[PDB]
């Protein structure tokens, strides 16, 4: 309320030797683990780590077409193996009925 | 009999892939999310016979193994940069490259890393994200009017 | 089975976002209104296996968790200043900064 | 300070709202696909035995 | 050389852009057909055994 | 089966072109901007037989 406008705090960030090695939790949290690395605390832009972008929010990287097509792929492969098991059953019932 | 086992194997494998895909689609729009993908690898193959070098007027012969089933080797997370949108709240930064925010439920003994940034003040002074945790960093010293980043 | 649960999860989540958005649009023009927005966060992930450090001539290995579902963490109200219009009634002030009646 | 003889309208921007009406809808549609394929795999399972 | 007191706008021509919005879309549609017919042949295969 | 893979391939390719185009249109008017464009090339072909 005085004329002055002091900076009142500062935000640290960190980086790991291996992203995606680190484990997930519920929430948007991640967690350090083996085959990941140590936290390596530093400042906002000097360690080779990127700058903040203020007043803006970062959306998910999920592309959607790639996802839907996989919904097709998975389904058809599933169907096929489902056929394998069925014919494999019918041969068995032919075996057991062979003796009568 | 044998084909039945390999067949059910592929079946549960595809099930596992479907679950991960279902998650990825399930949380589009959630901030800071990074999608994963399933990976497959063949099961050990029975070898009924061994390959052989040419001998007494005969040629060589190929190994005679069957090969049975398929299974999931690993998932992998993927960390490409996401798209950004602006908001009207000043206190919601999004990093533009690499590195994560730290948070902790305590004094900082157990840090957790995130790329989401819905930071906001409480009635009390602590600078908090969604649901609880207080973001790590450091405060100014009024005697000097200066931040002290080194510690 | 699993994907069905995660799938219905995302579905009700988007439902909840739609309701808030529906309110915001529903009361444009009402004086003094401040719009809100929905926020999402991932559900806890099952971890089928643990990550491991390199050992006997092998490299390390990534953790093998699945990850299931999405849910609403919180709404947030937003308090930016609105546009003003004049009226002909003298007794209808509008504050020009912060603070409430 | 007070501003006399004037009335303060809502802060809702409208374009931001309409675009979200699109976003929500499309995401909704997608999850709606997930559930459907998940059902069809189940009916293939139950019909597998016959 | 510098040109003082003036500001240099983007080189994007717009007609060239919009037409490409058409091209991309139609090619996308076509490949989308390819995948579909490719699926239907598969379901004919799996239903062939019944 | 084969045609399915080639078909999804072209699909994501056109997706990638759409993103770049979307950026170019998205920032008209920004000063000093220079637009980009996507480029395509064929994948390696299986050769069932020799000439």
Numbering used by the authors:
A (entry chain A): 752 to 851
B (entry chain A): 1 to 151
C (entry chain A): 1 to 101
D (entry chain A), E (entry chain A): 802 to 851
F (entry chain A): 1 to 51
Give sentences from the paper.
The assembly of about a 100 copies of a single protein, FlgE, makes the bacterial flagellar hook. The hook functions like a universal joint. It transmits the torque, produced by the motor located in the cell membrane, to the filament that acts like a propeller. Intriguingly, the C. jejuni hook protein, FlgEcj, has one of the longest amino acid sequences compared with other bacterial FlgE proteins.
We solved the structure of the hook of a fliK null mutant strain derived from C. jejuni strain 81116 (NCTC 11828) by electron cryo-microscopy, using single-particle averaging methods with image segment classification followed by systematic symmetry exploration. The final combined reconstruction yielded a map at 3.5 Å resolution that was used to build the model of FlgE. The structure of the hook protein of C. jejuni shows five distinct domains: D0, D1, D2, D3 and D4. The hook of C. jejuni is composed of 11 protofilaments that run along its length. The diameter of the hook is 280 Å, which is substantially wider than the hook of S. enterica that is 180 Å wide. In the hook, this central channel is made by the C-terminal α-helices from different protofilaments. These α-helices are closely packed and make the channel look like a continuous and smooth hollow structure with a diameter of 16 Å. The L-shaped stretch (L-stretch) [Gly32-Gln81] in domain D0 of FlgE is the segment of the hook structure that has the most contacts between the different FlgE molecules making the hook. The L-stretch is engulfed in a pocket surrounded by six molecules of FlgE that belong to four different protofilaments. However, the presence of domains D3 and D4 increase the number of interactions between the molecules of FlgE of C. jejuni, both within and between protofilaments.
